[PDB]
Design a protein around this ligand. Structure first.
Ligand SMILES: CCN(/C=C\N(C)C)C(=O)CNCc1cc(C(=O)O)ccn1
Ligand SMILES: [Mg+2]
Ligand SMILES: [Mg+2]
Ligand SMILES: [Mg+2]
Ligand SMILES: [Mn+2]
Ligand SMILES: [Zn+2]
Ligand SMILES: [Zn+2]
Length: 435
């Protein structure tokens, strides 16, 4: 049989009232939408931000994609001309007369076709800092119309959403670009993105500025490990293969002017129906905090580097309880409580090993490469073990036996807070959450 389209993902059409608070709205729809992993949001009809990129000074070198296996520079105009001619020539139809179902069926046939070499190009992962965002920004080099200044401050503006009140990553003001600053995607027909989840299992929000639709596939976070097991066992991967192995999949065609939200640890993939322009950014919420906690341990097991420290994030929020709504205060206290108990255990174990010397360290002021456990590559914040005779070495307190062979008298504790200081932080959170 030909490709079977998965069931359609949920589509949300917020009122103007609902639309005022993006993170509030997303929190509201989450119980339904997280059952699907992705969802589509259609803004009120007259919410229409003018495209802000200066088209004539936008240049890029797209990546080469051969469809059955997962280099000139272009301008936006010349990429589009190439894109349209390719589609019209391949389908032998007018460029805007090809049904999305037809493109979709042919895409998945091609991905699995060893004999045919269809190759396309994708302007993927373009920094919005390089040429500007698709959305207007306040401090722009462009004279903003009154209309554009309002869109510049909108919470649904992807430059603004990650620094909103209840956007948790705003508390880490280390730059960590790639998570806080939007990325651009210039697509042509068949240009694709493989199955993945976001850094630190964060949300992503995705907006299609213009062009032909972007076709999405999404998997609920609950089925994340099952998907990974199916892929390991049988091996990008056809959604039909996933569904026939017990993994739920949804689909959608994201049209111009529509948002797509990917929820924490929701696997997603897709391809573009034609020439288009999209913008995306990560964000993190109160309800994401447990996923963030778990992702650190997942990274640890994999010896992957962290973009940021979960410990540091929790403690920075805990230090300012009055900036937290009751939902966030509760979530932070939950995380903080077990962090403190683990730290009490780890420091006790350190004393039993014989280490007695200790120095206070403001880890958040160090570069990441001076913060990483040499064993599990995690970013230290609350504490670390170092050695006076081995200056390059550093381990987190979960790995005090993996620093060096020197005697206990030459090793010392580097700590952010004393054990005494931590109950006070917990108590302040608890009082706040009890308001
Ligand atoms: C927030 C965007 N971002 C930022 C880091 N990348 C540059 C690696 C991402 O990784 C998004 N994840 C990849 C992706 C790509 C697309 C796309 O090409 O349309 C759609 C959804 N997800
Ligand atoms: Mg417009
Ligand atoms: Mg939990
Ligand atoms: Mg857990
Ligand atoms: Mn993504
Ligand atoms: Zn470690
Ligand atoms: Zn040593």
């Amino acid at each position: 049989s030909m490709f079977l389209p998965p069931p359609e993902c949920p589509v949300f059409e917020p009122s103007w009232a609902e639309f005022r608070d993006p993170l509030g709205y997303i929190a509201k729809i989450r119980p339904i939408a997280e059952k699907s992993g992705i969802c589509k949001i259609r803004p009120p009809a007259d919410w229409q931000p003018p495209f802000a990129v200066e088209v004539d000074n936008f240049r890029f070198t797209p990546r080469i994609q051969r469809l059955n296996e997962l280099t000139r520079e272009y301008t936006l105009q010349s990429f589009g001309e190439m894109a349209d001619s390719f589609k019209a020539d391949y389908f032998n139809m007018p460029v805007h007369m090809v049904p999305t179902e037809l493109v979709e069926k042919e895409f998945w046939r091609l991905v699995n076709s060893i004999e045919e070499d269809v190759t396309v190009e994708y302007g993927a992962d373009i920094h919005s800092k390089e040429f500007g965002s698709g959305f207007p920004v306040s401090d722009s080099k462009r004279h903003l119309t009154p209309e554009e200044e309002e869109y510049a401050t909108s919470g649904w503006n992807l430059n603004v959403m990650p620094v909103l009140e209840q956007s948790v990553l705003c508390h880490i003001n280390a730059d960590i670009s790639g998570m806080k600053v939007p990325w651009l995607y210039v697509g042509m027909v068949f240009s694709a993105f493989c199955w993945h989840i976001e850094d630190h299992w964060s949300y992503s929000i995705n907006y299609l500025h213009w062009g032909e639709p972007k076709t999405w596939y999404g998997v609920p976070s609950l089925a994340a490990e099952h998907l990974e097991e199916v892929m390991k066992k049988l091996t990008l991967m056809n959604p039909n293969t996933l569904m026939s192995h017990g993994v739920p999949v949804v689909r959608t065609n994201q049209c111009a002017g529509e948002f797509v939200i990917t929820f924490p640890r929701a696997y997603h993939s897709g391809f573009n129906q034609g020439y288009n322009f999209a913008e995306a950014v990560n964000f993190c919420t109160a309800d994401w905090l447990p996923a963030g906690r778990q992702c650190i341990e997942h990274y640890r097991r994999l010896r992957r580097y962290c973009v940021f420290s979960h410990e540091e994030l929790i403690c920075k929020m805990a230090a300012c309880p009055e900036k937290l709504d009751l939902n966030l205060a509760a979530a932070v206290h939950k995380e903080m409580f077990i962090m403190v108990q683990e730290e009490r255990r780890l420091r006790k174990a350190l004393l039993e090993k014989g280490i007695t010397e200790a120095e206070r360290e403001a880890f958040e002021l160090l570069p990441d490469d001076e913060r990483q456990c040499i064993k599990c590559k995690t970013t230290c914040f609350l504490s670390a073990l170092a050695c006076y005779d081995c200056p390059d070495g550093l381990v987190c307190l979960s790995h005090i036996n993996d620093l060096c062979k020197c005697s206990s008298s030459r090793q010392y504790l580097r700590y952010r807070y004393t054990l005494d200081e931590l109950p006070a932080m917990l108590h302040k959170l608890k009082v706040r959450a009890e308001s």
